[PDB]
């Protein structure tokens, strides 16, 4: 899966 | 009305550093992230990194750790990167750009602040 | 690792319908791409977000000519009326989160010069 956690 | 406004035009000297800034405007600067990047030679953009302003939390491209160094300052609503130890190399046009904390999308650009290295 | 893969340049008949192609590493084929709009001396252009449906969500002051599509890993900007303004250089852009670090990864971008 894509995952964009910042 | 959203605006990036980046620092001046700035001549570094080979073995130095710089500090370039990006100050927002017309939006909760805590509410999204700023990220950096680097205007390639002949084509192109190159990540440098992202900084979370309300956490402090910094990734950076594995190419910069070392060199790159996102700061920001939640009162002046305001994010700095310094470039450290700088070569000819680092002559380029850097970019500060907006994104959500959930996409991949830089919405809005600054100006761009072009360094200059040279003896 | 995370690769988005563009041909460097590109030429199209004004008028005519353009197709650029953003593949993506096999990885990661279903990715959220953006792309972006690259013209001289002016900051880049965010253009839009494409998923892998095909459903895309183009940005402020982007015309109807400008459309997205998805094929696999491969991600498509469609240009209708290939017009002289449209003359860019097109870089897709993609993130995703290794571990808990963030990384964006650009393509080499895409010359696109209209001829004729």
């Known amino acids: 899966v894509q995952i964009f956690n910042k | 009305q959203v605006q990036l406004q980046q620092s001046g035009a700035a001549l570094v000297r080979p073995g130095t550093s710089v500090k370039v800034s990006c100050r927002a405007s017309e939006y909760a600067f805590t509410n999204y992230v700023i990220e950096w990047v680097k205007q390639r030679p002949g084509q192109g953009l190159e990540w440098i990194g992202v900084?979370?302003?309300?956490?402090?939390?910094?990734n950076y491209n594995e190419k910069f750790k070392g060199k790159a160094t996102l700061i920001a300052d939640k009162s002046s609503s305001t994010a700095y990167m310094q470039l450290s130890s700088l070569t000819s190399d680092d002559s380029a046009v850097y970019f500060c750009?907006?994104?959500?904390?959930?996409?991949?999308?830089?919405?809005?650009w600054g100006q761009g602040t072009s360094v200059t290295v040279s003896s | 690792q995370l690769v988005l893969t563009q041909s460097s340049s590109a030429s199209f008949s004004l008028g005519a319908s353009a197709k650029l192609t953003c593949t993506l590493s096999?990885?990661?084929?279903?990715?959220?791409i953006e792309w972006y709009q690259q013209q001289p001396l002016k900051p880049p252009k965010y253009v839009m977000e494409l998923k892998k449906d095909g459903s895309h969500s183009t940005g402020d002051g982007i015309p109807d000519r400008f459309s997205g599509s998805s094929s696999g890993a491969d991600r498509y900007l469609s240009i209708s009326n290939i017009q002289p303004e449209d003359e860019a250089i097109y870089i897709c852009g993609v993130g995703d989160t290794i571990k808990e670090q963030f990384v964006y990864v650009f393509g080499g971008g895409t010359k696109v010069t209209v001829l004729g």
């Open positions: 750009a907006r994104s959500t904390y959930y996409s991949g999308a830089l919405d809005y």
């Open positions: 096999s990885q990661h084929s279903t990715y959220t």
């Open positions: 900084i979370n302003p309300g956490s402090g939390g910094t």
